[PDB]
């Protein structure tokens, strides 16, 4: 069971109910963009729908195919949003196809919606009632002048992952440079072609033994030297 609030359950039980609103939020902070809020309808006063303080904007967007099943493959829902005016194109050329960002979906009954929306106000307004679920954009299946279609996926997907993941190599270091495991923090020394330099912008390790010797960090070398003698 999801820990749904009691008033939402009471609303679900009743025979005659209020409108069900889905409030889409597309988050591009991890990729490097801004977070965008969309909703399918305007409110009763012809203004953007106001939930808490967010004020989601009106825009034709639909998401279908959501499911909760662990027996077979992953779920892979689908989200369709229109770009007649070229917004999705502007986001995709810039933020590299909107691949990797988060999509958050909220389902709130219109009974609990904020009092700003209705012309006569709402006496039952309660901002705590919503049902939230998070997904991650996976691909842009289509992009046209009429619409654009994305396919979402679960944040925890196991398509390209292999467990042990760490390879024993004879001549190449697998660590990340200046990371936790390499443990190097000092002046810029060399380039990625083992050419001396001092600018901090173009300092990169070549993952070679000479590249590591430039740092005098041979102790933390990722690879295991002289294996190829035994493997032979």
């Amino acid at each position: 069971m999801q820990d749904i609030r009691q008033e939402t359950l009471n609303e679900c039980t009743r025979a005659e109910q209020s409108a069900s609103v889905v409030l889409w939020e597309i988050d591009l902070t991890e990729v490097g963009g801004e977070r965008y809020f969309f909703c399918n309808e305007q409110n009763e006063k012809g203004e953007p729908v106001t939930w808490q303080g967010r004020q989601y904007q009106p825009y034709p967007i639909q998401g279908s195919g959501f499911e909760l099943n662990g027996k077979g493959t992953s779920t892979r829902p689908t989200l369709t949003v229109s770009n007649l005016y070229g917004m999705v194109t502007g986001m995709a050329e810039d933020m590299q196809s909107l691949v990797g960002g988060t999509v958050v979906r909220r389902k709130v009954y219109a009974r609990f919606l904020d009092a700003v929306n209705f012309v006569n106000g709402n006496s039952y307004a309660d901002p705590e009632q919503e049902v939230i679920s998070r997904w991650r954009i996976e691909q842009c299946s289509e992009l046209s002048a009429v619409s654009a279609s994305f396919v979402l996926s679960t944040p925890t997907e196991t398509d390209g992952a292999v467990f042990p993941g760490r390879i024993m190599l004879a001549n190449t270091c697998t660590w990340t440079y200046r990371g936790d495991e390499c443990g190097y923090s000092g002046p810029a020394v060399a380039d990625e072609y083992d050419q001396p330099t001092s600018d901090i912008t173009k300092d990169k390790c070549s993952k070679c033994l000479s590249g590591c010797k430039f740092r005098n960090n041979v102790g933390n070398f990722g690879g295991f030297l002289s294996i190829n003698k035994l493997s032979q």
Binding site: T13, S20, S64, F66, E67, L68, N69, G70, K71
Partner: protein, 49 residues
């Protein structure tokens, strides 16, 4: 008509009631999938428990 021992507070009209006989055995189940549908309904699949 029945005559219950006590009437819980605020039992509105058109609310679900179940009769639990001692003879009959419960038929439990365990959900395995809940497919959200466009009409606003949910399809639920279960396996015996």
């Amino acid at each position: 008509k029945v005559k219950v021992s006590r009437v819980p507070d605020g039992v509105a009209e058109y609310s679900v009631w179940e009769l639990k006989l001692p003879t009959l055995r419960q038929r439990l189940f365990r959900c395995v999938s809940i497919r959200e549908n466009d009409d606003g309904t949910y399809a639920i699949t279960a396996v015996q428990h």
